[PDB]
């Protein structure tokens, strides 16, 4: 990270799959089921 190597790393690893707009899409664009 710029702080350490985990807080943003987690945010990055999480945002990469949780960011903000792709979730509403993910629930339909990715279409789990």
From Swiss-Prot:
It comes from the Eukaryota. It is found in: Cell membrane; Cell projection, Dendrite; Perikaryon. Belongs to the G-protein coupled receptor 1 family. The chain holds residues 240 to 272 of 360 of the full protein. Heterotrimeric G protein-coupled receptor for endocannabinoid 2-arachidonoylglycerol mediating inhibition of adenylate cyclase. May function in inflammatory response, nociceptive transmission and bone homeostasis. Changing residue 5 to E: Loss of ligand binding. Alters agonist-induced inhibitory effect on adenylate cyclase. Preferentially expressed in cells of the immune system with higher expression in B-cells and NK cells (at protein level). Expressed in skin in suprabasal layers and hair follicles (at protein level). Highly expressed in tonsil and to a lower extent in spleen, peripheral blood mononuclear cells, and thymus. PubMed:14657172 could not detect expression in normal brain. Expressed in brain by perivascular microglial cells and dorsal root ganglion sensory neurons (at protein level). It comes from Homo sapiens. Induction: In macrophages, down-regulated by endocannabinoid anandamide/AEA. The gene is CNR2. The chain crosses the membrane at residues 8-28. This is Cannabinoid receptor 2.
